[PDB]
């Protein structure tokens, strides 16, 4: 169970000199989007473009996925993305991430009908 | 179950938002700290001082609680806090918060033995 003292910590404590700094984004986002459940997802990319633009990638340049499959697509334009990668000392339940903001083309794997993104493959 | 498409959206989509966006701090924190589970917590304050300093408040100025309770103490100094308040359009499952940073004295309700902070009462 969670003690009352632990709950107060969870709900109200965030010690830090620049709590809202962009360097804390990955830590907060990976937590919020539940990618730190039982383990720390080692790498994950967030795309800051409209869902419509990302879905449209499924009808763009067809490329080969890192895994051999050929259901991957690369965006014609670059997109604003944030790479979140576990730091050296990241260790469950203390997951830690480095935030890197870049502008690159995205490669996603598409599936279903109509075709929509189902996995983030890489960026170039 | 969560579809492959919905999962892709959860893990990878953050449209119209950016890591450098400080006003989005409350949205990320309320989510990450589980205060948007099944309902939207209306108001919540995060303290950016060290935990040792917040715990020390339990031995400071005894005051009447502002919210309905007892055993409240007011910090002798001001502390850096972020006030998170639901926006007028907030509605579960779409919770939304307005972020406000400010420096004020905090009043916390203490309990346990040793006495430690268990509820956040108000900032003055
Ligand atoms: N993963 C994660 N990171 C968080 C959270 N809240 C804030 N952060 C981030 O964590 C960074 C600093 O971490 P810290 O100084 O180690 O502070 C941690 C964190 O704010 C809190 C909840 O996890 O526990 C703290 N913690 C964690 C482990 C430990 O040994 N000691 C300790 O104080 C900040 O830059 C911020 O971005 C959270 O709930 N989860
Ligand atoms: N969703 C997810 N993907 C992961 C994880 N760990 C690795 N991956 C990715 O999935 C690939 C294997 O499948 C790996 O090469 C890697 O890119 C994880 O915890 N979660
Ligand atoms: N499964 C999975 N793997 C990912 C994700 N994001 C990145 N990866 C993996 O991590 C690798 C490196 O990331 P990248 O996006 O392909 O390319 C990186 C990044 O854009 C740039 C920043 O200066 O340096 C590169 N390193 C990828 O090849 C891929 O294997 C993601 O969301 N999911
Ligand atoms: N329970 C609770 N109430 C809070 C919190 N922050 C503010 N409030 C409530 O909202 C009012 C306004 O906030 P303030 O920080 O006192 O200004 C307070 O008087 C109190 O009722 C918080 O984190 N928790």
Curated annotation (Swiss-Prot), chains A, B:
GO cellular component entries: extracellular region
Catalysed conversion reaction: an [RNA] containing cytidine + H2O = an [RNA]-3'-cytidine-3'-phosphate + a 5'-hydroxy-ribonucleotide-3'-[RNA]; an [RNA] containing uridine + H2O = an [RNA]-3'-uridine-3'-phosphate + a 5'-hydroxy-ribonucleotide-3'-[RNA]
Annotated control of activity: Allosteric regulation by both substrate and reaction products.
Intrachain disulfide bonds: 26-84, 40-95, 58-110, 65-72
Residues binding substrate, per UniProt: 7, 10, 41-45, 66, 85
Biological process according to GO: defense response to Gram-positive bacterium
Active-site feature positions: 12 (proton acceptor), 119 (proton donor)
Enzyme Commission numbers on file: 4.6.1.18
Localization per record: Secreted
Keywords: Allosteric enzyme, Disulfide bond, Endonuclease, Hydrolase, Lyase, Nuclease, Secreted, Signal
Deamidated asparagine: modified positions: 67
Tissue expression from the record: Seminal plasma. Can reach 3% of the protein content of this fluid.
Catalytic class of the enzyme: lyase
GO molecular function, one term: identical protein binding
Top-rank lineage group of the source organism: Eukaryota
Claim: Disulfide bond is one of the keywords in the record: yes
Complex formation: Homodimer; disulfide-linked.
Family statement drawn from the similarity comment of this UniProt entry: Belongs to the pancreatic ribonuclease family.
Extra remark: Progressive deamidation of Asn-67 transforms the homodimer (beta- 2) into and heterodimer (alpha-beta) and finally a doubly deamidated dimer (alpha-2).
Its biological purpose: This enzyme hydrolyzes both single- and double-stranded RNA.
The protein's name: Seminal ribonuclease
């Amino acid at each position: 169970k969670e003690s009352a003292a632990a709950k107060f910590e969870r709900q109200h404590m965030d010690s830090g000199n620049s709590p809202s700094s962009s360097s804390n984004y990955c830590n907060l986002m990976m937590c919020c989007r539940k990618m730190t459940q039982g383990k720390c997802k080692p790498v994950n990319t967030f795309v800051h473009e409209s869902l419509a633009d990302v879905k449209a990638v499924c009808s763009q340049k067809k490329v080969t996925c890192k895994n051999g499959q050929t259901n991957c697509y690369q965006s014609k334009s670059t997109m604003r993305i944030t790479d979140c990668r576990e730091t050296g000392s990241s260790k469950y339940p203390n997951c830690a991430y480095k935030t890197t903001q870049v502008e690159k083309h995205i490669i996603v794997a598409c599936g279903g009908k109509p075709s929509v993104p189902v996995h983030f493959d890489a960026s170039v």
